[PDB]
């Protein structure tokens, strides 16, 4: 579960992409941002565990970005988790599971 107030577009990224890097994939959003500023983070394989920092998120904007070219024959899918907090410290959301699919060039 839980969807909460997350708004997430589906995420695919073609393998063998050209720069410049980092490149915007999608903008992640929590509906809690129109009742105060929200600050975003991500976790999982490809984020904070190996391979680290293949994906990053811009804390203030929610822009999820890829930092280098991908290879479908190495890693074809990634499961990430996003997190949302206020000014403040809470946690205006529970984590969201985020699937990223590596597609054709």
């Amino acid at each position: 579960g839980p969807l909460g107030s997350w708004v997430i577009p589906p995420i695919s990224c073609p393998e063998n992409e050209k720069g410049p890097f980092p490149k915007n994939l999608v903008q992640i959003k929590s509906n809690k941002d129109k009742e105060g500023k929200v600050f975003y983070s991500i976790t999982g394989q490809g984020a904070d565990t190996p391979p680290v920092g293949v994906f990053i998120i811009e804390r203030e904007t929610g822009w999820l970005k890829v930092t280098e070219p991908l290879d479908r024959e190495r890693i074809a899918t990634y499961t990430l988790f996003s997190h949302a907090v206020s000014s403040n410290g809470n946690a205006v959301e529970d984590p969201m599971e985020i699937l990223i699919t590596v597609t054709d060039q």
């Binding site: 969807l3 909460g4 107030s5 720069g19 410049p20 915007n24 903008q27």
Partner: protein
Amino acid sequence: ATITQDTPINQIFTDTALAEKMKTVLGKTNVTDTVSQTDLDQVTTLQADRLGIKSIDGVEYLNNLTQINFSNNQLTDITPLKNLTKLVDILMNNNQIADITPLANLTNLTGLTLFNNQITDIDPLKNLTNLNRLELSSNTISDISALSGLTSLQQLSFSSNQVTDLKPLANLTTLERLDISSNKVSDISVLAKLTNLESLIATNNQISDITPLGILTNLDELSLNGNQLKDIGTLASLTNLTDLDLANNQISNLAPLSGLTKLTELKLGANQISNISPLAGLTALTNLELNENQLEDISPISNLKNLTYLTLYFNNISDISPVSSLTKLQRLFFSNNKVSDVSSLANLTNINWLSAGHNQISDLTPLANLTRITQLGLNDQAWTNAPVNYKANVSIPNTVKNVTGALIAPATISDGGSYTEPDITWNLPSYTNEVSYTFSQPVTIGKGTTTFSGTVTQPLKA
């Protein structure tokens, strides 16, 4: 640079982690094993990302290196690179590099990646005129004057810096892909000169005037998310656009978009839109974002048959039925609207994410067969019933129905009221203008789980 005689690997590469990497590269079986200058001279490329390397001391003996990847390490000093003039490509993002002076004479460089570092002064880049790819995001750069002579650049990013003045981009007419997001940019007039631009990403700046984009007719991708746009008349000129992001601005007039029929993705969330008629002909759209606007009539959406992703949340929408023909929809977000009737949602048989919180939904039965759902949102509904006569004792039917068709018992009932299925009853000694009740019921449809909850207001008429 040459080692005088055969030296143990761990005396050349003093970094514990680089020593281990070099042991493997050089085909030795232990870090204390000796290596010659001819062994070192065989290494032409080096993939050494994500190894917790703190020093590249030793790399200066690898004379023939043409490509290096030291990204995602803990590098500060990059002095050992100074004389490695055969270097063509450097990947070195995610380190703690403050001084890039050692790059100044690496004139054969065609690609240089330095995002996520501690770089301020980019003067050492000024003579790297063969560069075709340069990546400088997430540093502390405020002056890009050193970019002015980099006349072979095709890809350039310096997002997440402190740049106000773009004038140094003037002569970089070879630019095809530019990212200037999250800087201090208000004036994009210099961009009128970059007529070969195909992609411009400029989110989170202070841009209000987009007239300089008029002649950039090769643009297929444009992001101006998080600026100060209102007049978007210029975008009518950009007939090649397939991807456009204009979210978080002050746009009300969408007429300039009406001819942009190549568009497959369009973001217009967080604006001043009340009228979507100009979007009716954009039938190649797969993604459309319209959240946080002032929409009521969404009928012009019915034509957009290719939509797989749609946002409508935070609007004034009562009638959701124009989504019924959008049979390819996989994700639909319409929280914070005035929707009561979700009968039309039965048509969206491929729906996977359905976010419908903060509406006026009382009956989940039209959703019962939507078994491809994996994410579901039905919390915090609220509606006001048609008034009923105030009496000493008032009875109303409970109308809250689960996906099974069964009535959901109230969670709480105001004014000491009670429930006997299907009726909610109140003993009211004196006149009151309204009574209310709440419900809260966890529910799963397919594999999507939510709490279907809300507050029902019952006005009493005297």
